[PDB]
Design a binder for this molecule. Structure first.
Ligand SMILES: [Ca+2]
Ligand SMILES: [Ca+2]
Ligand SMILES: [Cl-]
Ligand SMILES: [Cl-]
Lengths: 266, 265
């Protein structure tokens, strides 16, 4: 009768959300699916992204999940409303939780948003933020290089420092006191970004609030488990299981995990 | 008439510690607040009576057209949350679960102290919630019956408050507890004194912030967030309006507040 929390993503970035779920909800089993054969999603057409997101959704629903996290900013924007309406389990994305966390952390209502070209172009974060607080001013900044620096493992190195300083220089001209990491890969750069931005700026890992919302929703529906003793996490990918496993076992401190290859769509 | 309020119910001024954070995180939402000052304390009351009173406050605010309810009182949450959630057609949340999440996020060694009322402690709601989230947590609870009295009397910044806090909390210093949950919504009014007493190795937690984020999340989830530009909060007490205003205006920074007296019985 034990059921997983499902996570869907285009790749490995959603693992940063899983990381916070492991901390905050240690009794819950996680089923994660990264569609690495077809990432990036950012460049793709909304219809296509919804179709892909439904394929991933349907796969995890067949596997038995009691809640779904769309742990991808692009998929969250393209499909959240339709999936939430059609499924009878709770479904959330990462954008409303990140926005909430920013509104909690800000003191001057000047917020920065870092993300992919697609994310920043969507205006999803400004729309969420401003709907909650009309006084907020939001500066959005595309950071095209960051995903590569993280996936390639360079995110602690001298390269990351230079890439962060280069990319975020515009933000230094502002009085922003809060920066939302609006791409699930970006938490791996968080210490470097905090260093560049300085001690007056709160840097938001939206996985932390997302995990809290999962916990709250599970409680709200009386679905929280009491033990981790028969926990069997499962990781699924459409791309290379080895490349995925190599990253995941490091980010999640899980040397013994198993990654299942799957075939979706076409 | 198009905006509807979020309702908050409490034994007295404690619920204001949740309201403060709602005003911050949800600045366009209207608050309707009811404190049952005339029957405070709820702490030493039997669970059946706490539930009865909590239902009285609920009915009052439901009749005023609230769109969501926050039980901003820990003993009431323990007594009545599930029954009120189950019977109402509007979302209802309590304050024990958010406090429990917040404490577990702050702890470094998994050793948590809970301060609360006699009723909250007897219920074991906090240890049950905490261990339900992380079975490796170690929880110790302490009943602090004088704390509510000092807060409701407007004496929470005084020499007497400092003595009472020192008297009650001294046993926590003989432990390795690194996190203390303020498990009565009145207790944040005493937080500077408690922080100074406990010292800097101990995270003292006001769960109002975590409660307000949950209110925000549930409104969004159910498509209940206010999208209008209407500009008027309403406070109700079963005791003296002046004494309530003196405390509320200190805690909230809201010089022009509307406070009215009501009868529940
Ligand atoms: Ca109204
Ligand atoms: Ca231990
Ligand atoms: Cl008591
Ligand atoms: Cl209480």
């Amino acid at each position: 009768m034990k059921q997983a929390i499902g996570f869907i993503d285009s790749g490995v970035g959603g693992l940063t959300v899983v990381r916070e779920v492991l901390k905050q909800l240690p009794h819950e089993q996680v089923y994660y699916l990264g569609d690495t054969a077809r990432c990036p999603y950012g460049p793709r057409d909304k219809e296509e992204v919804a179709k892909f997101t439904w394929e991933m959704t349907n796969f995890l629903v067949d596997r038995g999940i009691k809640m779904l996290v769309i742990a991808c900013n692009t998929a969250t924007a393209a499909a959240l409303y339709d999936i939430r309406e059609k499924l009878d389990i709770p479904v959330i994305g990462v954008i409303q939780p990140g926005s909430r966390a920013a509104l909690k952390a800000t003191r001057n209502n000047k917020i920065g948003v870092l993300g992919t070209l697609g994310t920043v172009e969507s205006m999803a974060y400004p729309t969420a933020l401003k709907g909650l607080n009309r006084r907020v001013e939001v500066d959005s900044l595309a950071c095209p290089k960051f995903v590569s620096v993280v996936e390639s493992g360079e995110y602690k190195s001298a390269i990351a420092k230079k890439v962060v300083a280069e990319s975020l220089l515009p933000l230094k001209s502002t009085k922003i006191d809060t920066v939302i990491l609006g791409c699930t890969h970006y938490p791996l750069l968080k210490p470097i970004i905090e260093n560049f931005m300085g001690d007056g700026v709160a840097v938001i890992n939206s996985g932390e609030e997302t995990a809290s919302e999962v916990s709250a929703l599970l409680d709200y529906h009386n679905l929280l488990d009491a033990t981790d003793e028969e926990i069997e996490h499962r990781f699924f990918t459409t791309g290379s299981t080895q490349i995925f496993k190599d990253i995941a076992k490091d980010w999640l401190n899980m040397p013994d995990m198993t990654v299942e290859h799957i075939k979706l769509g076409k």
